[PDB]
């Protein structure tokens, strides 16, 4: 909420998570805030995911601005457990990143473009 | 020295407490959701041990039985009303806004919904003076002009039992019996009649206060006795 500045529609989120699953089964993904943060810094992040139900918020606060001064696009997910399941984890995940997608390059690109229009 | 009587008071020991367990009811304005729709019948008139004045037992339409701070002229059988659209008759309770100016009121609220604070003793009453969209001015029994929220509820009429103060106690026994019903230590020994150790005015070979009686507001407890921050004293001038 303090780091969230734009609302992502449920349908748009569905598109994003579906793309994440195929991204792990084809390309490559990073699970967990630490790994996600390094991707944004190293430049290998194509699309980063950030959960909105993170408590404490400190854990993710930095993403929305780190991704900006690195030109990396990000999208907000409503639930931490859905992001983790999409990434293929039994547990939840505060943040994940698509490091080089796979057969989702078109979808991801569009999703990234849709977010820009959504402010 | 030793702590003065005023200090023993604050400890709230048995001697200084009021016989609450003997008290009847915390006479507060009945709560109503809205719309005003609420009335009751006076079932009886009782003596209130805490105020030495009469109190009306009232049974409401919803079945609630509660003692009420009775104004003068209320009797068994009478129908009392409480709400925004209540009838402007003695015994009824409605916000100061709905109460026409120039009309005597009692048991006035200080903050809307508190249940009544001002003008509750025998015979007293507050005078509702000015209306407004923001404030209703009332003249309390002390003569002070009190600006209040027009939403503050109040009962119409003067409190019952007026004139109680007109008859003298005559003898100590009568005072004794009244005192026994209040949170007060009685009788009263004059400070000047005590030993120096017991009170600032104590000591001396003859009875007279040590220094002058008018004490500063800033005086600490144990010393604040006599004429507390008096703006003047005596009768002349």
């Amino acid at each position: 909420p303090v780091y969230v500045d734009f609302d992502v529609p449920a349908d748009l989120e569905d598109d994003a998570l579906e793309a994440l699953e195929v991204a792990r089964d084809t390309g490559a993904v990073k699970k967990g805030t630490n790994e996600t943060t390094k991707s944004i810094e190293r430049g290998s992040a194509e699309l980063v995911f950030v959960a909105e139900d993170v408590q404490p918020e400190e854990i993710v606060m930095h993403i929305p601005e780190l991704a900006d001064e690195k030109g990396v696009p990000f999208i907000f997910v409503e639930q931490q457990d859905d992001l983790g399941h999409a990434a293929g984890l039994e547990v939840g995940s505060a943040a994940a990143a698509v490091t080089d997608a796979g057969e989702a390059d078109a979808d991801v690109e569009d999703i990234a473009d849709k977010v820009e229009e959504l402010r | 020295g030793r702590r003065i009587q005023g200090q023993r008071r604050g400890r709230g020991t048995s001697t200084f407490r009021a016989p609450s367990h003997r008290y009847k009811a915390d006479l507060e304005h009945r709560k109503v959701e809205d719309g005003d729709v609420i009335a009751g019948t006076v079932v009886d008139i009782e003596h209130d041990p805490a105020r030495s004045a009469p109190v009306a037992a009232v049974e409401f339409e919803d079945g609630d039985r509660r003692l009420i701070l009775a104004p003068e002229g209320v009797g068994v059988g009478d129908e009392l009303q409480v709400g925004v659209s209540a009838e402007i008759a003695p015994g009824n309770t409605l916000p100061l806004a709905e109460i026409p100016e120039g009309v005597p009121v009692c048991n006035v609220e200080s903050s809307p919904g508190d249940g009544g604070k001002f003008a509750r003793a025998s015979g007293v009453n507050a005078q509702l003076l000015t209306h407004d969209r923001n404030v209703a001015v009332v003249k309390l029994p002390s003569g002070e002009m009190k600006r209040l929220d027009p939403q503050c509820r109040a009962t119409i009429g003067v409190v019952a039992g007026g004139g109680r103060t007109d008859k003298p106690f005559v003898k100590a026994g009568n005072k004794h019996h009244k005192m026994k019903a209040r949170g007060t230590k009685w009788p009263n020994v004059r400070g000047v009649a005590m030993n120096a150790v017991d009170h600032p005015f104590g000591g001396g070979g003859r009875q007279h206060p040590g220094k002058p009686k008018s004490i500063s507001r800033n005086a600490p407890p144990g010393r604040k006795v006599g004429d507390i921050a008096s703006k003047r004293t005596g009768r002349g001038g």
Partner: protein, 194 residues
């Protein structure tokens, strides 16, 4: 490159600036309505917790404790006292609020032992600290190479004896040289002059 943790750390270097400021103003409202000791699922400051020995593991607990701000709540003398000993107002306690916080927490969890604690801010009348506690009886910890040291009998009630880091710090044991003459090996052994 930088750890995600380093960002939580950097944010907390100035709890009155940026997002953290907004966050604190919001949380403190909820904290003021909470109890004295409140167990919490996750540390408010991950970097600090982990840095202090915390682990997302069974037997590791965290609790936020609030203690009143200010000097000693002292009762004035009721018998003869020389002017030096007649004070009340300016007297301060020798244990710091963080240490009081740690103890109040340890008492709430009789079976757990205090591992460490850290500050999470303060309003105008109280301070909050989050204490990391450990269950010395859970096998998850009895087998943890990094934490099983706290399972030793001599670590029982370590907070009440000042064995905590904040405890040792408050006992004036930081310096190994000059200034620590009356503090090491213990305040009591040095006649209580530390």
């Amino acid at each position: 490159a930088r750890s995600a943790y380093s960002y939580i750390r950097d944010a907390w270097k100035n709890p009155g600036d940026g997002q953290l400021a907004e966050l604190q103003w919001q949380r403190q409202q909820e904290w003021r309505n909470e109890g004295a000791v409140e167990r919490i699922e996750r540390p408010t400051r991950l970097d600090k917790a982990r840095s202090q020995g915390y682990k997302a593991k069974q037997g590791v607990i965290v609790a936020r404790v609030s203690v009143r701000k200010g000097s000693a709540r002292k009762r004035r003398h009721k018998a003869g006292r020389r002017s030096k000993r007649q004070g009340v107002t300016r007297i301060t306690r020798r244990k710091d609020i963080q240490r009081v916080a740690e103890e109040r927490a340890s008492r709430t969890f009789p079976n757990l032992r205090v591992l460490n604690s850290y500050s999470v801010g303060q309003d105008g009348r109280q301070k909050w600290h989050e204490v990391i506690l450990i269950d010395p009886n859970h096998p998850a910890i009895q087998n943890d190479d990094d934490l099983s040291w706290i399972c030793a009998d001599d670590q029982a009630d370590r907070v009440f004896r000042g064995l905590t880091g904040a405890g040792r710090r408050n006992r004036g044991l930081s310096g190994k040289g000059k200034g620590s003459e009356k503090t090491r090996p213990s305040l009591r052994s040095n006649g209580g002059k530390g």
